[PDB]
């Protein structure tokens, strides 16, 4: 007598997990994996106009606590949007496609070519902000440009802020375009440094060693910003994503007002049959409080 | 082996310090300091007068660090002058003091009395423009306040710096700090800012000040510790670079040291195993050295094999 169900933009999600934009979901193989999983949905890696061969490598590190990646590597958004035309079994689950343009021009002419497809199939779109969005008008101006250019609704993937005069500039600003309709909270905690103490060298080849952090790493910033959104954007869907291994790690996010949450180095280092085990630890909190449904504690984290 | 340092026209004996805030509010704690191991120690930030600070709980241990909301409570600066004249033991290892008044006229007034003091025993200041519970991450205010403090203190100084996490602003900050020739010294980090925390069981955030959101300490922070580490180490090559972030063993310590850091402060860990831990990471520090043939920490400071 329990669900997980998330009803959301108007679609219904057997329970709110997905893959983080960029982990499993650059290959057909890996969407496909992704679609097969017991995750409510997916989305795919964020796209530009042409393919991009990315980074050199080693661009990605496991470490103890997390990940730390410079990526920079992509299909093309032609790749993804006709995945999203014609290759995603809908009736599995709902699709995001994730893009992320080097421009307010490219991105725009990216969104009409998905107008059709988004109103066709369904697919829905998270635009990548993250930086764009640590420069406020900038940040005003991709969303106008994004929604003259896009009839439909969009969300946004939002960088990691540390200060409430931040999180106040940000929300005035997405507030304005009622279009963006869930903000994700968060991209990576950006320009780590990781040092190997044998090598005594850093373990990524770009940007001198420089590089996003993901895991256990960005939890607490990332339960702020999601629970910074939720009270600042009462009228959009907050998406939390960073540092959930546990199904009690979910239960936070959505304590702190997520509907859905992302899952982005655990399922990197774990496989699509994290979700199976996800689902069943968020349940079994549910179980021990007799929480029937997440609308009966999204966004309810209490003061002392 | 050594882990000597010789900076700022003192010899330490090794590069450990505590991070500013953790043991060091009370002439106690000062002491226990200064009774340790440690290499140096530095005082609570203070204000002009006695702070009794944010409502508790304002502190609270996580699995990988902490999260506090503490809020500057402080004796007030007239205490820790008085422990900076009187009271320290100068022979047993060099001290210093942080400020972190609320306007840069506070602070330059505090420096005004501190100059004699600091000219007479040899204390050295460290300005806190990083107060998360913020000035360096709004440069031209910063500019103002290192203007201030360089009219009013005729001595060389330190900042301790918030985290960035990008480039744009690691050369904006830079501009500015290797623009005032007194800044000797950049101590990169103060906490990661407006963390939170929520328990599972209570459903209730840890700490009460500010709807629980708090500064971040700990392995949390030690990825971006290193990053601003290094990013000032490449970009200011005429100051110091002190480390602070994320410091539990000597390894950790290494490769701060490896980043560019010429001393290391230790917070959270510290306030968890109390002053014994500057004997740990000396030998701990001291170990990996040896592994690796290291005589002195200058065979490896700012030595990390990058790009
Ligand atoms: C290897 C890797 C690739 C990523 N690629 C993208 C991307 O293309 N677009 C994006 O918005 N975020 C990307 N991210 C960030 C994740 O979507 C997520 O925000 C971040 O990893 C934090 O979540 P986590 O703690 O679960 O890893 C990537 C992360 C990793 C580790
Ligand atoms: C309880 C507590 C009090 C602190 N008080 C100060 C302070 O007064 N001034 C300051 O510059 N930093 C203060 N800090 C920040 C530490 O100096 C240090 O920058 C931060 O904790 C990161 O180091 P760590 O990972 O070893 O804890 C405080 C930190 C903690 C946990
Ligand atoms: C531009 C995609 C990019 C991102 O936004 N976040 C990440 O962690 N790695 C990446 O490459
Ligand atoms: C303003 C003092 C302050 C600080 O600088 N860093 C921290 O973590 N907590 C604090 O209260």
Do not use: W
């Not at 725009?108 to 420069?135: F, H, T, W």
Request: proline content about 5%.
């Amino acid at each position: 007598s329990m669900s997980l169900q998330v009803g959301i933009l108007g679609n219904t999600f057997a329970n709110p997990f997905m893959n983080a934009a960029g982990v499993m979901c650059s290959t057909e193989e890996e969407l496909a994996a992704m679609t097969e999983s017991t995750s409510g949905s997916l989305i795919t890696k964020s796209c530009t106009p042409a393919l991009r061969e990315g980074n050199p490598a080693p661009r990605y590190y496991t470490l103890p606590l997390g990940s730390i990646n410079s990526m920079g590597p992509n299909k093309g958004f032609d790749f993804y949007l006709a995945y999203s035309a014609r290759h995603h079994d809908y009736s599995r689950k709902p699709l995001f496609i994730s893009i992320s343009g080097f421009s307010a021009e490219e991105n725009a002419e990216m969104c009409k070519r998905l107008a059709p497809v988004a109103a066709e199939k369904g697919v829905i779109l998270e635009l990548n902000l993250s930086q764009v969005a640590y420069d406020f008008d900038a940040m005003r101006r991709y969303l106008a440009a994004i929604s003259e250019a896009y009839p439909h609704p969009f969300g946004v993937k939002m960088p990691p802020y540390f200060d409430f005069a931040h999180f106040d500039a940000a929300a005035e600003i997405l507030n304005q375009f009622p279009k963006v309709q869930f903000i994700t909270c968060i991209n990576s905690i950006g320009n780590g440094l990781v040092i190997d103490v044998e090598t005594e060298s850093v373990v990524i080849k770009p940007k001198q060693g420089f590089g996003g952090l993901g895991g256990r790493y960005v939890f607490p910033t990332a339960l702020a910003n999601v629970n910074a959104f939720y009270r600042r954007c009462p009228g959009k869907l907050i998406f939390g994503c960073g540092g959930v291994y546990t199904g009690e790690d979910a239960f936070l996010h959505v304590l702190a007002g997520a509907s859905m949450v992302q899952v982005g180095t655990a399922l990197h280092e774990e496989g699509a049959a994290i979700f199976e085990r996800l689902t069943a630890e968020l349940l079994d909190v549910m179980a021990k409080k007799g929480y029937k449904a997440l609308d009966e504690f999204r966004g309810k984290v209490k003061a002392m």
